[PDB]
Symmetry: C5
C-alpha cells in the first residue's frame, strides 16, 4: 500500500498540488504504456491526412471529421465511470474488513487455558497455531504473492507452519474440495479434549472460546466468496466500450483541419492538442482506479500487503500465548491516588489544544 | 458463474481490453438476438425511403426526420439506467449473502455431541441431515435448476436426502403452506431429547446449538422473502419504455438524408452507421446487466451455481461429523519452540514482498 | 403483491418487452385517470388557439409559446426524481424487514417448555398466543385492510384471537396510549411463573426465551415509528411542483404552430404529439412509483398482503407448539452410512449443471 | 411532526396534488418571508432601469444583462442540492433511531426482580426511575423545548423526576463535565446490591439486566455525539453560496428588455415572470428541506416531539413495573383447542383481501 | 471542532445566510492563500496581453482564447466532486464512530469487582488504567497533537499514565511492531488472577468483563487500519487534475477581449470578473471540504479534539471506579407513589409543546 496520510494532515497552500509530483502508484506510472499508443496513432493519422491524401480525399476526410465530432456529446462515460467506481471501492473496503486477526482469540486462549508447565504450553501453542493455519491456507488460495511464497503444501511444513503428521492427516481426506475448513474442526476437537480435563474450569469459558472461531470461519468464508464471485463481465465490458469509443471518436474528429475553408470552429492550428491530453489523463485515470482496485490481492502498489501479516500475526500470537501467560507488572499506587481531579501536564508545543468540555448545545440560551 | 479474477490481478497495458474478446456471458452473446432486428428494421426503412417514396413523400419524410432528431435530447436514460442498476446489484449481492452454510453448526455438533459409538453416530448424522434438508427444500422452492433436479418430493427420498418415514410424517401435516420450517422443529426436538440423556453435558452447550439454527432459519426466511417480493413492475416498465423510445426515435431520425438540400448537419452519406451501433451496444448492455441480474437463481452464465453446494455441503458435513469426531493429529513441539522471533523463509520469486512493519503515521515528525 | 420472478429467470430475446402487456399494477392502470385530463386540456387549448383567436392574438400566442418553450431546459426533474425515489425504495424495504415472524420463538417454546399433558399444553398455547396478539394489534393499528377486518377490539374476541377475560383486563388500564405493549409484559410474567415450577429446567433456558421477545418488541416499535414519522411534506411538495411545472410548460409551448412564418423549429404539422406522450408516460411513471411505495400498507396491487400472515402465522405456530411437541420420525441409518463420498444422482434435464469445485483463483499459475 | 400517511395510502387521481393546499410545514410557510425580498428587489431594479436610466445607461444595462444571462448555465446547484440533502436526511434518520425507549428493560425488571411487597416495590420503582433520569438529562442537554421545560436542575426535583437526596448527591461530584452518566452507575450499584440478597435468583439474570443498560448508554452517547459534531461549515457555506449566486444572476439577467432592438430571445414583455417564480419555489424548497432537517430537536413543525415521550415513557414504565408485576389474566382453553386448521372469519368490507399462500416461484413449471 | 447547532435549530428569514459572516473554519480562511495567486496570474496575463503584445500577437491571442473557451464544457468536475466527497464524508464519520469510550466497561468493573478496602481499590484502579493506556497508545500513534503532547514513552510515565515497572516490562518484549496490544493481555491476565480469589463471584461475570475488552480492541484495530490504509493516490490525483485544468482553461479564455471585432459573446468590458470569482469560490470550497476531511486527526478547525478525551475519560473512569463503588443515594418513596397517571407540570414558555398521543394512522377512518 501507499501511505500519504502524514502529508495531508492539515490544509495548506499546497496540499493536494504537491501530490502530483509522486511517481509510485500514480496515473503517470499507470498510463505511461497507453499514452504512447494514443500519441503515435494521432500523429500517424495527422501525417497521413496532411501528406498522402489528395484534395478530394482531404474534403472527404474533413466531412467525416465534422460528422465524428458531432458525436462527442458526452455519452454517459461520466455516469458509468462513478456508478461503477463506487461499487468497486465499496467491494474493496468490504474485502479489507474481512481479514482475520487472531487478537480477540489469543487473549481468550492465554487468559482461560490454565497451567504454567509442559502439556499446558504445548496445548496453548497448538491451539493458537491451528487458527493461523486456516488463515494461511485461505490467503494462499486467494493471493498471488502468498501463493508464490508457498507454491506447495510441503513448503508450509518446511516453513514451520505445520507438522509432518498434520500434513499426512490432511492428505488422507480424499475430497475434491478446498481443505481450508479442517483446522477449525481440529480446534474444536482439541478444545473439547482440553475441557475434558483440568485445563478449562467451566463450560461458560468453553462456549466463549468456540464463539470467536465461528466468527473467524465466517470471515474466511466471506473472503473466499469475494474471490469466487466477481463483478459481472457484462458491466465491465460495457464500461470499457463506453470509455474506448470516446477516444476512438476523438482521434478522428479532434484534429486541426485546414483554416482556408472558414470552418465553424477550426480557426487556428496548434502543433499538439493541449486540452485533449488533459481529457485523456482524467478519463483514463478514472478507469485505472477501477482497473487497480478490481483485485486487491495482487502485486500492484495500492494492493494489500498480505505477506507481512502472516508473520506479524504468528510472532505476536506465539509471544502472547507463551511468554506472557500470567506474567504481569507489579501493582503499585498510581500518581493520582489521593486526587479526585487529575490534571496531566501540557507541553509547550501542544498548549494550543487546551479546551473546555462541551456541555450541550442548549447551554446559555 | 464466470470467474476472471486471475486475469485482472495487476494493471497492465491490456487488462480491460483483452476482456472484449470473451464470448461466454458477454454483451455480444446477450445481444446477438436483438441486434439483427434493429439492423433489419433500419435497412428496410432506408430502402423504402430511398426507392418507394416519391418527391413529396421524401420531403415529408425529411421533415419528420428532423422533427424526430430534435427529440434525441438524452432523455434521462443515463439516469434511470444506473439508478435502477445500483438497486439491482445491491439486491443481487444481498441475495447471495443469505445462502446457508452449515459450517458454524457442523463444528459445534461434532465438538459437543459426545459418544464415539452407535446411537451417537446415528444421532450426530441425523442432526446434521435435518439442517441440510431445510436448505434443500428452500433452494428447490426458489431455484429452477434445483427444481429440475428434484421435481417431486419422492426424488429426495430416492436421492438419499430423506427417509421414507420422514416423507410419510411430512405428508401428514395437512397445511396449505410451504413445509420448509418442519426440519428446524425436528432439530430442536431431537436436540432436547439428546440433552435428556448422556450426550449433552450442560444447558450452556444446548442454548449454543439452538442459536445457529435460529440464524439459519432467518437466512432461509430472507431468501424466501427475496423470492416472493420483487422489484416493482412500474419501475421495470418505466425503465424499459425509456430505453426503447430512444432507439425508436433513432431509427427514423438518424438516417443519412439526401445532401442536395444543404441540410444543417446531414452532409456526407455513409453506408452503415458507425456511431449508432456503438450507442446501441452501450445503452443495451447497460440494460442487459439488470435483465441478467434480476433473478440470480436461473440458468444464465452469471447466475449462482446452487446445484454444486447441495452436494459439497452434504459431503463436507457428513465427513466432518462422522469421520473426524475426535480424530486429531498428534501434539508435538513445533519449529519455533525456543525462538521468540520466528522468521519464516522467503522464496526467490517472492523476495520483493519483504516490508517493514507500519508504526503509525506520526512516526518521525 | 405482484410476482413476476418466474418470468425473468433467464435473459431471452423478449424478456423485458413482454412485461409491457401487463395491466394489473402497471403504468397504464396508474395513469389512465390522469392521461385523459392532459389530453383534454391539450386539445381544448389547440382548438381555442386555432379557431377563436384572431391574427393579433395568434401572434401573441406564438410569441408566448416560444417564450414558454425556451423554459423547458430539463429543470432537475431527472435529479429530484431518483434522489427521492431511492429514499422511498430504501424506506419501503426497511419497512418490510421489520415484519415479526414468530419462527425463532415457536421453536424455542416447543423445545424448552416441557410437559406432554394438560397444564403444559395450555401453558405453551397461551405463551404462543400472547406473541401473535401483539403483532395483530400493531398491524391493525398501522394497516388499512387489517383495520377493516378488525374495526373493534370485540372483533378480536369474536375471532378467537383473545379471550373475554383478556379483553376485560386490557380495558382496565386507564392510559391514553396505544396498548400494543401489554402482551409482552404478560409473556414475561407467564414465563417467570412457568420457571417457578417444573416446566423450565434452568435459568439459561429462561434468558434465551426472553431474548426473542425483546427483538420482536423492537421490530414492532420500528414498525410503529415508521408509521408515525413520514417523509417531509416539504420534500414531497418540492418534487410534485417540479414535476407539474414541466407539463404545465409543455401544454403551451409544445404545440404545432403555423408553418407560414418560417419559425426556427416548427416546420411540419402533426395531428397528435407522439414524443410528448412518451415523455408524459416516462416522467409520470417515475413519480407514480413513489406515489405507490410511499405507504406499503394499503390497498394497491404492489402493497404488502398483511391479511395472509396473521392467519398463516397463527396456524403454523399453533400446530408447531401443540401437535409436534416431541413427535419426531424414527432414527434409521441413511443411504450413505458406509460411503465417505456421497454422489447424489443427476436427472437428464439437469445434467448440464454439473461443475467442478472452485479451488481458488491462484490455482495453476 | 406532521403525519399525512393516512392520506397517501392508495394512488388515486389526486394524491400528490391535494397535498399542495397544506399550509402547516410547507414551502409556502417556509418561504413567505424570503419571497417578498426577492419580489421587492426585482421590481425596484425594473423600475429603476425603466424610469431613471437614460439611453446610454440603458444600453449598458442591456449589455450587462446579456453578459449576466450567459452565466446561468446551471452551475451544479442541482448536484450540490441532493448530494447535501441525502447526507442531511441520513443523519436525520440516524438521529431518530438513537432515541432510548425503556421497553426492553421494563419487561426484564418487572419479570426478574422478585418480591410483591414493600422493599420490592421500592426497589423496582427506583431501578426504573434511574433509567428515565439519564434520558431526561441528555434530552434536556440536547433539546431546546425540553430545556425550556426544565431550565434548572431544581425543576427536575420539583417535577418529581428525582429526589432532594439525589440532587444533593449529584451536586457533590466536583467535575467540569456533563453529568449524564451517573444514573447508569447508580443503576449498576443498586442491581448488585439487590443481587446480594433475595431479590435476584441467579447471576445469569444479573448479566442480562446489565446488558440493556449498556445499550441505552451507547444510544445516549450517540445522541450526544450527533449533537456535538455537526456537518462542516465549509460544506454548508459552499451550498449556500452556490444557491444564492444563481438568484443574484437571475435578478439582473432575467428581466424583460426593450423589444425595439431585435434582441435574440427577448421578444415579448410580460408584467410578472411566471417561470422564474416557479424556479425560485423549487430551488428554494430544495434548500429549505436541509435548513429544516439540519437540527431535528427544535421548534419547527417537522421536528421530533421529545416533550411527549418523557411523560409517555414515565407513565408506561411506572405502570408496568408496579401495577402489573405478576397480575395476568386467567388461563383458559381457546377457541381452536380441537381444530388443527383455524379459519378466522372475514368481514364483508375486507373480503377482497383473501389470497392463497405463495408456494415458490418454481411451482408449476 | 466547530459547533453551530444552536444557531440552526429553527428555520428563519436568515438562518443559512448569517453563517456566511463566520471566519474560523470557513471557505474564506481556507482560500485566502490561493485566491491571491489566481488574481495575480489573471491580472499579469491581462496586462501582458493589453500592453506588450502587438497586433498580430493580439489576433493570435484572441484565436487561442476562443479555442480555450470552447473547452470549458463542464468536464465532469461536478461529478468527481461529490462522488469523491461522499466517500470522504463516509470515511470521516466511520473514523469518528470507532473512538473508544470506556463507559460500558467502567460500569461493569465498578459493579462486579467486589471489595471496599485496599487490594480491592488497587485492583479496580489498575484494571481501569490498563484500558486507558491502550487508547492513549493508539491515539498517540495516529494523532499529531497527541504525539506532540507525548513525544516519548517516558512522557507517559512522567504524566502518570503508567508506572516505571510497566515501562520496563514493555521495553523487554523485543518485537519490531507497534506495542498497542499488550495492555489488553495484561487486563485479561489480571482479570483471571482476580477471579482466582474472592473478588469475582462467578464465571458468568468474568465472560462479561472480557467481552467489552474484545470490542475495545476491535475498535482500536479499526482506527489503526483506517490510519494505515488511505484513499487511493490515483483517485486523489484524478480529482486534483480535473479541478485544476478547469481554472487553467479559465485563466486564458475568460478574459475581456477587444470589442472592436464584433466577436460573438465578448461585447462589454468589465474591470474585474464577477461571475468567475464566484465559480472559483464554489468549485474550490467543494474541494477544500475533502482536503480538510481527508485526515480527521490533525490541527485544522474542523478536526477531532482528541486531547480533551484522554483527560475526560481518565477523570471520569477514575472517579467512577473508586469514589462511587457502592455509594448510592437513599431509597425513598417518590412523588407518584399512589398515582397511576403521573402528570408532570408544564412551564409557561413551553406550554405550546403539549400534544396528544399518536394512536395509529388508521384511527378514525
Ligand atoms: Ca490489483
Ligand atoms: Ca438470471
Ligand atoms: Ca400504497
Ligand atoms: Ca429544526
Ligand atoms: Ca485535517
Ligand atoms: Cl462460511
Ligand atoms: Cl485540442
Ligand atoms: Cl423468518
Ligand atoms: Cl451514425
Ligand atoms: Cl421500541
Ligand atoms: Cl411532439
Ligand atoms: Cl458512549
Ligand atoms: Cl420569466
Ligand atoms: Cl483488530
Ligand atoms: Cl466574468
Amino acid at each position: 500500500t501507499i501511505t500519504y496520510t502524514n502529508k495531508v494532515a492539515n490544509a495548506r497552500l499546497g496540499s493536494f498540488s504537491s501530490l502530483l509530483l509522486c511517481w509510485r502508484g500514480s496515473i503517470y506510472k499507470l498510463l505511461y504504456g497507453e499514452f504512447l499508443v494514443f500519441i503515435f496513432l494521432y500523429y500517424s493519422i495527422r501525417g497521413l491526412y496532411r501528406m498522402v491524401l489528395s484534395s478530394d480525399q482531404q474534403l472527404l476526410f474533413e466531412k467525416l471529421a465534422l460528422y465524428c465530432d458531432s458525436y462527442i456529446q458526452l455519452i454517459p462515460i461520466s455516469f458509468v465511470l462513478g456508478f461503477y467506481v463506487t461499487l468497486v471501492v465499496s467491494r474493496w473496503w468490504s474485502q479489507y474488513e474481512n481479514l482475520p486477526w487472531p487478537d480477540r482469540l489469543m487473549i481468550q486462549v492465554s487468559s482461560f487455558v490454565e497451567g504454567k508447565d509442559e502439556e499446558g504450553r504445548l496445548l496453548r501453542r497448538t491451539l493458537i497455531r491451528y487458527a493461523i493455519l486456516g488463515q494461511v491456507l485461505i490467503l494462499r488460495s486467494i493471493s498471488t504473492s502468498v501463493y508464490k511464497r508457498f507454491p506447495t503444501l510441503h513448503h508450509l511444513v518446511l516453513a514451520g507452519f505445520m507438522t509432518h503428521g498434520e500434513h499426512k492427516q490432511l492428505q488422507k481426506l480424499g475430497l475434491p474440495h478446498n481443505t481450508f475448513w479442517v483446522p477449525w474442526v481440529w480446534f474444536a476437537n482439541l478444545s473439547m479434549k482440553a475441557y475434558l480435563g483440568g485445563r478449562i474450569r467451566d463450560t461458560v469459558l468453553l462456549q466463549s472460546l468456540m464463539n470467536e472461531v465461528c466468527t473467524l470461519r465466517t470471515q474466511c468464508g466471506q473472503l473466499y466468496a469475494y474471490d469466487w464471485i466477481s463483478i459481472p463481465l457484462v458491466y465491465t465490458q460495457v464500461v470499457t466500450v463506453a470509455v474506448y469509443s470516446f477516444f476512438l471518436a476523438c482521434l478522428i474528429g479532434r484534429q486541426f483541419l485546414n483554416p482556408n475553408k472558414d470552418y465553424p470552429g477550426h480557426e487556428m492550428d496548434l502543433v499538439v492538442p493541449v486540452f485533449t491530453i488533459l481529457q485523456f489523463l482524467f478519463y483514463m485515470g478514472w478507469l485505472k482506479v477501477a482497473e487497480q482496485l478490481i483485485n486487491p490481492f495482487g502485486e500492484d502498489d495500492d494492493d494489500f500487503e498480505t505477506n507481512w501479516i502472516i508473520d506479524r500475526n504468528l510472532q505476536v500470537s506465539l509471544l502472547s500465548v507463551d511468554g506472557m501467560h500470567q506474567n504481569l507488572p507489579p501493582m503499585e499506587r498510581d500518581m493520582y491516588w489521593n486526587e479526585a481531579a487529575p490534571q496531566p501536564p501540557y507541553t509547550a508545543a501542544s498548549a494550543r489544544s487546551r479546551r473546555h468540555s462541551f456541555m450541550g448545545s442548549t447551554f446559555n440560551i
